[PDB]
UniProtKB/Swiss-Prot annotation, chain A:
Protein's organism: Saccharomyces cerevisiae (strain ATCC 204508 / S288c) (Baker's yeast)
Assembly behavior: Component of the small ribosomal subunit (SSU). Mature yeast ribosomes consist of a small (40S) and a large (60S) subunit. The 40S small subunit contains 1 molecule of ribosomal RNA (18S rRNA) and 33 different proteins (encoded by 57 genes). The large 60S subunit contains 3 rRNA molecules (25S, 5.8S and 5S rRNA) and 46 different proteins (encoded by 81 genes).
GO biological process: maturation of SSU-rRNA from tricistronic rRNA transcript (SSU-rRNA, 5.8S rRNA, LSU-rRNA); ribosomal small subunit assembly; translation
Domain of life, per lineage: Eukaryota
Molecular function GO terms recorded: rRNA binding; structural constituent of ribosome
Membership in a protein family: Belongs to the universal ribosomal protein uS17 family.
Matching InterPro entries: NA-bd_OB-fold (IPR012340), Ribosomal_uS17 (IPR000266), Ribosomal_uS17_arc/euk (IPR028333), Ribosomal_uS17_CS (IPR019979), Ribosomal_uS17_N (IPR032440)
Cellular localisation: Cytoplasm
A matching Pfam family: Ribosomal_S17
Entry protein name: Small ribosomal subunit protein uS17A
Extra facts: There are 2 genes for uS17 in yeast.
Swiss-Prot record, chain C:
Any Gene Ontology CC annotation: cytosol
Disulfide bond positions: none
Protein name per Swiss-Prot or TrEMBL: Small ribosomal subunit protein uS8A
Alphabetized InterPro entries for the sequence: Ribosomal_uS8, Ribosomal_uS8_CS, Ribosomal_uS8_sf
Main location: cytoplasm
GO molecular function: structural constituent of ribosome
Purpose: Component of the ribosome, a large ribonucleoprotein complex responsible for the synthesis of proteins in the cell. The small ribosomal subunit (SSU) binds messenger RNAs (mRNAs) and translates the encoded message by selecting cognate aminoacyl-transfer RNA (tRNA) molecules. The large subunit (LSU) contains the ribosomal catalytic site termed the peptidyl transferase center (PTC), which catalyzes the formation of peptide bonds, thereby polymerizing the amino acids delivered by tRNAs into a polypeptide chain.
Subcellular location, record wording: Cytoplasm
Pfam families: Ribosomal_S8
Originating species: Saccharomyces cerevisiae (strain ATCC 204508 / S288c)
Biological process terms in GO annotation: cytoplasmic translation
Record-stated family: Belongs to the universal ribosomal protein uS8 family.
From Swiss-Prot, chain D:
Residue ranges occupied by any S4 RNA-binding domain in the UniProt entry: 41-104
Protein name: Small ribosomal subunit protein eS4A
Keyword Amino-acid biosynthesis: no
Coiled-coil portions: none
PANTHER family recorded: 30S/40S RIBOSOMAL PROTEIN S4 (PTHR11581), SMALL RIBOSOMAL SUBUNIT PROTEIN ES4 (PTHR11581:SF0)
Main location: cytoplasm
Subcellular location: Cytoplasm
Keywords, in A-Z order: Cytoplasm, Isopeptide bond, Phosphoprotein, Ribonucleoprotein, Ribosomal protein, RNA-binding, rRNA-binding, Ubl conjugation
Origin species: Saccharomyces cerevisiae (strain ATCC 204508 / S288c) (Baker's yeast)
InterPro entries in the cross-refs: KOW, Rib_uL2_dom2, Ribosomal_eS4, Ribosomal_eS4_C, Ribosomal_eS4_central_region, Ribosomal_eS4_central_sf, Ribosomal_eS4_KOW, Ribosomal_eS4_N
Residue numbers of Phosphothreonine PTMs: 114
GO BP terms: cytoplasmic translation; translation
Swiss-Prot record, chain E:
One Gene Ontology term, aspect cellular component: cytosolic small ribosomal subunit
Stated family: Belongs to the eukaryotic ribosomal protein eS8 family.
Other notes: Present with 15900 molecules/cell in log phase SD medium. There are 2 genes for eS8 in yeast.
Disulfide bond entries: none
Keyword annotations from UniProtKB, A to Z: Cytoplasm, Phosphoprotein, Ribonucleoprotein, Ribosomal protein
Name this polypeptide is given: Small ribosomal subunit protein eS8A
Length: 142, 144, 129, 258, 187
RNA sequence: GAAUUUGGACAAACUUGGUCAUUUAGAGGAACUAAAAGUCGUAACAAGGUUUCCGUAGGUGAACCUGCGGAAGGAUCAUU
RNA sequence: CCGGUUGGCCGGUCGGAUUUCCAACGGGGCCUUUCCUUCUGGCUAACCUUGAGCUUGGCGAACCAGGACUUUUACUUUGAAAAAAUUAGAGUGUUCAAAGCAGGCGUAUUGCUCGAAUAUAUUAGCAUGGAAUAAUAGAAUAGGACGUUUGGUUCUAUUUU
RNA sequence: AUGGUAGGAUAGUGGCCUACCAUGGUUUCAACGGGUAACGGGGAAUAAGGGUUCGAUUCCGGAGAGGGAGCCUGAGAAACG
């Protein structure tokens, strides 16, 4: 959020070409889409300047499959957070339950700002990395 | 509140307590440590063949006055030495020497059976012929 | 400390009915205590009770006839499905013709036989016979 | 492993074929065709186990090679050709015409139809798209591709297919008050009118359905096949008409006729 | 050989996996192309399902597109000047995707003369009508036209030479040209 | 287009170590159990003939003995 | 107020059931301070209407469609999608039975015909009704909810001139 | 090793591999290690209710062809008649 152009390659959206001949307002062509399933595309994606190839709104991924909910327990990666899904597991012999949990690494777009303690909902995508298969679609706590 | 936890989310404590206290048993500990596979002469099988080493005159415990007529046998699969009690009246006159005997337990699940101090096995067959068939003169032995 | 005010209420009622007394003071008088007592009262196991309003939680004075053998609580409130009701009634009722397992279902607190009529289940609270 | 399987053990075959568990280790594995191998009926099990016109697979092959049977008007001298839902089967010796429709027990019925009716079949459209050079097409439930369709035909409609040509005669849309056939699931074989459909964006649209005795049920949209408006169907329904009498009413009806 | 699977790596917890399976063929990997410049040499690779794949080794020319001008010409490649993954590819003159190269630029100047009638850097009536009608579009940019004076244009490789065999690209323009220019002129 | 040949990745194996998970021999010890008409005493059981037991320290042929603090499971429910 | 099941009713045929009916159990509609949210259209559902008692001109789910605002769970009900075999189980005299899924009935010559049920199958995922019981959130240096206001910044963008 | 950006390779996604960069990722709710006389499931035996023990083996999935590794052909093999 201090520069866009940090890497050695030119960061740009693929096949979105801004014609150097013309001169208008609305400075650059920015491609964005709605991810579907009633998730609202955030204004920071529509108006921003970040590139973020793995974004569910401006980038080349699609949300399909499970929609999950967790609480952010780690933000120390770059564009990646770890959420914690807590559930109760039933044991039939003793006729009662026990607390269990899983950690899910999810990708977070620069449209969203999360801290530790926020509740997020994530949507399944194709494999992003070795462990990441989920992508943040709405941050709605603090 | 009767000891143990009763809460609806307290299944983990109950499970691990049951495992820890399951180790206090005899059959469970024996089956899970696998002492039959490791520290048993038969190695967990029901029967075993062996080779007779000598004939013993083990005397019974008190109060009982007798000579119990067992044999020492070296197991064929292990090479382990084993004492086996030759069951009936006069049946030690079949079990003479260097023979292939078949052995079983006595039924006491690894314990020494009676007044007989320290034998845990009995003879079933000698030289491929069963001992009761020899005893009831249904069959008779080969030469060797 | 006090975890189950309903359990304390039912234990006090049991001690009173063992001793032969016709009354008992219950403290501290929750809502589930009122609904449990109303279930016991409709089947004729207690009689009239009165809710004393002090401003903290309430007390209750129940009047006891001689008809109650044992009212009990089941702690924890196990989740109970519809076949589970018949196994619970077979375990903790003295006969198949009288006694009630009380269970809090989503349509209010009721006994097991009215729950069979409404075809609804829930969590088990206690029993009465 | 290592490639496609070519055998099919008995006890793994679909249960609605009604193949007895003894008399052989194998079942006739349906070859690749217009229908999925679970929701299909090979011609060997139709000719031998349902019509009893043969005693062996060898006799079924002997019937097939003299080009007697033809399925949807094409000859098909294949033993395990998958005949599926709404296929017509013509036996010109005996001049017989069958349509594969389910009875309410969930099995394929021997539904004899007339010679006028054997001239068509219904198909549920599975996708409408634009092929190459911008030509639209539909794909029916048995995989027929039909070019230049009507623009009003969207998915989950039924189109009437001519079976001499591959052309479309007319079509039934999808809304409330439409007579449906359930092909798939627990309610397989039942016929009822659709009351309403549930949007469920993200997977598995449900549809609520009530038969003539006012018994409702619900099914996924994958298993529903619209067959007309309420009253007239576009095909002849089999005996029973998809009613699903309970077992109490069924032994009462059996003790009537016995 | 080269396997493409994830069972040989550690788990996310960090444990060492046991060898579940021998290396399967549907997870194979193949050696790189390392496409040099000059004297075109295309080998074939038979891949999964038939489906031939063209390893270009040592490609010479390419089809390069001028995006603001909407054309594309078959132009000779001079050499790679920048690569965001590795400097040894710039040194060894390997051609991959996203390689910044220099191209010949003479077909582009021939098209620009034949289309607009003005020369870059420093007869019939029909051509006069055509060249007058598309006026006020013959003023492209400063940076590209200075390259046209120098006869070498900066292009970016948009094709994958080890996969298709072809080395296609587009001429650098605008802010992307300024970015790679600051990268190139950086000491 | 054959032999041959350069680099590379994959990599079976080999030689020299070094760790650990497994067996054998083994001078000697060092106990425990069972069975044993052995030897010397008599520590405990009665106030067991010095009440017994605990923890700790030292000593002694063997039980055990002695110091310090504790217990009653004591031989005292008891002195307005 | 209203219908839903079990009754009950002249035992109407001498163990069949036309409901004016008593009773019990289980739902729904409305009012009582009771918001248990509604921005655009066709269609009007009830419907203003209404013909002398089938008429021409009122409230959108009554029927859908379109977008917009959504405290979060656990629990329980119903259902979908859960491979056969095996388990439980229905029909059928393998001569009985274990089995099997066969078989039965005629003028047995042209044949006719009933079947191959059904239930269970956890935990997780999915759809749905309930909302008791356990939790969770909210308006407190108001930054709160409203709002026909009275306005100002700022962003799209149609049909049109 | 966990992630980021580009490439390469693949039928394709992905530290799958490379270059550069950042310091992450798992764990008492039991990670990591060790053991298994451990292929998993449908299922079996014995049970009032709850359970306990087993499942190499008629079906479904996986793996292997003395041990390892490499590959040709082909739509499909890291194939062992
Ligand atoms: Mg609790
Ligand atoms: Mg012992
Ligand atoms: Mg004795
Ligand atoms: Mg095979
Ligand atoms: Mg076949
Ligand atoms: Mg002493
Ligand atoms: Mg003494
Ligand atoms: Mg003494
Ligand atoms: Mg003493
Ligand atoms: Mg990549
Ligand atoms: Mg990467
Ligand atoms: Mg093994
Ligand atoms: Mg084995
Ligand atoms: Mg197998
Ligand atoms: Mg193999
Ligand atoms: Mg071998
Ligand atoms: Mg091999
Ligand atoms: Mg062989």
């Amino acid at each position: 959020e201090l520069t866009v152009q940090s890497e050695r390659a030119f960061q740009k959206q693929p096949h979105i070409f801004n014609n150097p001949k013309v001169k208008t307002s609305k400075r650059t062509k920015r491609w964005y889409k709605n991810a579907g399933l009633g998730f609202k595309t955030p204004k920071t994606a529509i108006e921003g300047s970040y590139i973020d190839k793995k974004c569910p709104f401006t980038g080349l991924v699609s949300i399909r499959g499970k929609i999950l909910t967790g609480t952010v327990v780690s933000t120390k990666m770059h564009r990646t957070i770890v959420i914690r899904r807590a559930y109760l597991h039933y044991i039939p012999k003793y006729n009662r339950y026990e607390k269990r949990h899983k950690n899910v690494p999810v990708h977070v777009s620069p449209a969203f700002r999360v801290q530790v303690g926020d509740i997020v909902t994530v949507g399944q995508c194709r494999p992003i990395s070795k462990t990441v298969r989920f992508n943040v679609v709405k941050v709605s706590a603090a | 509140g009767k000891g143990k936890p009763r809460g609806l989310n307290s299944a983990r404590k109950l499970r691990v307590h049951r495992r820890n206290n399951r180790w206090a048993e005899n059959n469970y500990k024996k089956r899970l440590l696998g002492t039959a596979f490791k520290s048993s002469p038969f190695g967990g099988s029901s029967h075993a063949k062996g080779i007779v080493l000598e004939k013993l005159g083990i005397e019974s415990k008190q109060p009982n006055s007798a000579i119990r007529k067992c044999v020492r046998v070296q197991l064929i699969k292990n090479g382990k030495k084993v004492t086996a009690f030759v069951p009936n009246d006069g049946c030690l006159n079949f079990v003479d020497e260097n023979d292939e005997v078949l052995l079983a337990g006595f039924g006491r699940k690894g314990k020494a059976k009676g007044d007989i101090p320290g034998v845990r096995f009995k003879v079933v067959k000698v030289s491929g012929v069963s001992l009761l068939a020899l005893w009831k003169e249904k069959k008779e032995k080969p030469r060797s | 400390t006090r975890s189950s005010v309903l359990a304390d209420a039912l234990n006090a009622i049991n001690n009173a009915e063992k001793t032969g007394k016709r009354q008992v003071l219950i403290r501290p008088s929750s809502k589930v205590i009122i609904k449990f007592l109303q279930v016991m009262q409709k089947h004729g196991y207690i009689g009239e009770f009165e809710y004393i309003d002090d401003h903290r939680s309430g007390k209750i004075v129940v009047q006891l006839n001689g008809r109650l053998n044992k009212c009990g609580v089941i702690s924890p409130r196990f989740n109970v499905k519809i076949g589970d009701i018949e196994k619970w009634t077979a375990n903790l009722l003295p006969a198949r013709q009288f006694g009630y397992v009380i269970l809090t279902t989503s349509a209010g607190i009721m006994d097991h036989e009215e729950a069979r009529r409404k075809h609804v289940s829930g969590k088990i609270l206690g029993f009465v016979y | 492993a290592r490639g496609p399987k070519k055998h099919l053990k008995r006890l793994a075959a679909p249960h609605h074929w009604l193949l007895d568990k003894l008399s052989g280790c194998y079942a006739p594995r349906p070859s690749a065709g217009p229908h999925k191998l679970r929701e299909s009926l090979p011609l060997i099990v139709f000719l031998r186990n349902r019509l009893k016109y043969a005693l062996n697979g060898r006799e079924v092959k002997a019937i097939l090679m003299q080009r007697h049977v033809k399925v949807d008007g094409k000859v098909r001298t294949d033993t395990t050709y998958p005949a599926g839902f709404m296929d017509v089967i013509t036996l010109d010796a005996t001049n017989e015409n069958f349509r594969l429709v389910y009875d309410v027990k969930g099995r394929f019925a021997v539904h004899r139809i007339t010679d006028e009716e054997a001239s068509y079949k219904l198909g549920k459209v599975k996708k409408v798209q634009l092929g190459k050079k911008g030509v639209p097409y539909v794909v029916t439930h048995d995989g027929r591709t039909i070019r230049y369709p009507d623009p009003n035909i969207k998915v989950n409609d039924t189109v009437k297919i001519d079976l001499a040509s591959g052309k479309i005669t007319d079509f039934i849309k999808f809304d409330a008050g439409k007579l449906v056939y359930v092909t798939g699931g627990r309610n397989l074989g039942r016929i009822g009118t659709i009351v309403h459909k549930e949007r469920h964006d993200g997977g598995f649209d449900l549809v609520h359905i009530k038969d003539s005795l006012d018994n409702t049920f619900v099914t996924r949209l994958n298993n529903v096949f619209v067959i007309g408006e309420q009253g007239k169907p576009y095909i002849s329904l089999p005996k029973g008409k998809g009613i699903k009498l309970s077992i109490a009413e069924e032994r009462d009806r059996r003790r009537a006729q016995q | 050989g080269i396997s493409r699977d994830s069972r040989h790596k550690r788990s996310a917890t960090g444990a060492k996996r046991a060898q579940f399976r021998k290396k399967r063929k549907f997870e194979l990997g193949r050696q790189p192309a390392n496409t040099k410049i000059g004297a075109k040499r295309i080998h074939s690779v038979r891949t999964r399902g038939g489906n031939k794949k063209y390893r270009a080794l040592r490609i010479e020319t390419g089809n390069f597109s001028w995006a603001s001008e909407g054309i594309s010409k078959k132009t000779r490649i001079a050499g790679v000047v920048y690569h965001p993954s590795n400097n040894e590819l710039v040194r060894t003159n390997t051609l991959t995707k996203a390689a910044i190269v220099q191209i010949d630029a003479t077909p582009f100047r021939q098209w620009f003369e034949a289309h607009y009638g003005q020369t870059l850097g420093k007869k019939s009536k029909n051509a006069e009508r055509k060249w007058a009608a598309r006026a006020a579009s013959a003023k492209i940019e400063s940076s590209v036209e200075s390259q046209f004076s120098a006869g070498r244009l900066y292009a970016c490789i948009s094709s994958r030479p080890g996969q298709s065999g072809r080395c296609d690209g587009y001429i650098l323009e605008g802010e992307e040209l300024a970015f790679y220019l600051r990268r190139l002129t950086a000491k």
